[PDB]
Amino acid sequence: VGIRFCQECNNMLYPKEDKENRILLYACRNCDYQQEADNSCIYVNKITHEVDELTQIIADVSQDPTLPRTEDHPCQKCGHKEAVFFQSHSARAEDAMRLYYVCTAPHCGHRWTE
Amino acid sequence: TVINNWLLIEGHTIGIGDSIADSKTYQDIQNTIKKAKQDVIEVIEKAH
Ligand SMILES: [Zn+2]
Ligand SMILES: [Zn+2]
């Protein structure tokens, strides 16, 4: 999945085949540094990719003066009443007009979606 | 010619009295507008 780098030349490690022990080795093209990986999966491609933005929503959006606010949706963690909300606010999100919420209490930053 | 010289008797105009409605009509229009805005709000709530 991710990119792993050689410790000698600090270049990308390409996958190379070990035709003796039937094992996967990551080797670079600059030096002869070898490795054994734990992912065991070279490549992964998901075409749905309906990523939940709760990973990508920052908790600092609560300081936006231009966002709507509601008090009928208390925070799950700290029980604070006021909570900002907004839509997907991102492209490649199909057409879902689902709402997203962020707690406005400082240092809480709870970001959920009912 | 005939219609113009007769129109010199009847006359024609356009004014605010011709562009103003009645109180009952104003109430009807405002009611309809409020109902439509409420329905739009309901649709938005269902979408959310
Ligand atoms: Zn290397
Ligand atoms: Zn909270």
| Shared domain check, A55 and A31 | no
Helix (H, G, I), strand (E, B) or coil at A108: coil
| Shared domain check, A52 and A104 | yes
Under 8 Å between Cβ of A71 and A84: no
> Resolution, in Å, please?
4.3
The parent domain of residue A67 ranges over: 46-114
Helix (H, G, I), strand (E, B) or coil at B30: helix
Tell me how far apart the alpha carbons of residues A54 and A57 are, in angstroms, rounded to a whole number.
5
| Shared domain check, A78 and A28 | no
Tell me how far apart the alpha carbons of residues B47 and B39 are, in angstroms, rounded to a whole number.
12
The Cα of A87 is separated from the nearest Cα of chain B by a number of Å equal to 9
| Shared domain check, A59 and A24 | no
| Shared domain check, A100 and A81 | yes
Tell me how far apart the alpha carbons of residues A64 and A85 are, in angstroms, rounded to a whole number.
11
| Shared domain check, A92 and A68 | yes
Residues with C-beta atoms within 5 A of ion ligand 2: A 75, 78, 80, 103, 105, 108, 110
Tell me how far apart the alpha carbons of residues B37 and A56 are, in angstroms, rounded to a whole number.
34
| Shared domain check, A104 and A94 | yes
Q: How many cross-chain Cβ pairs, A to B, lie less than 8 Å apart? A: 4
Under 8 Å between Cβ of A102 and A59: yes
Name the strand (E) or helix (H) holding A102: strand A100-103
Under 8 Å between Cβ of A83 and A102: yes
Helix (H, G, I), strand (E, B) or coil at A101: strand
DSSP letter at A106? T
| Shared domain check, A39 and A50 | no
Task: Give CA angle at A49 (A48, A52), nearest 5°.
Answer: 130
| Shared domain check, A59 and A29 | no
Number of domains in chain A: 2
Tell me how far apart the alpha carbons of residues B38 and A64 are, in angstroms, rounded to a whole number.
28
B47 touches chain A (CB under 8 A): yes
Nearest to A1 by CA among A51, A35, A41: A41
A99 touches chain B (CB under 8 A): yes
Confirm whether residue A31 is marked as ligand binding: yes
For chain A, give the longest Cα–Cα distance.
65
Helix (H, G, I), strand (E, B) or coil at B10: helix
Name the strand (E) or helix (H) holding B32: helix B23-47
Q: Which residue of chain A comes nearest to B48, CA vs CA?
A: A98
| Shared domain check, A109 and A53 | yes
Nearest to A71 by CA among A61, A85, A84, A81: A81
| Shared domain check, A87 and A39 | no
Pairing label, strands A111-112, A83-86: unpaired
Name the structure determination technique.
Answer: cryo-EM
CATH number at residue A73: 2.20.25.10
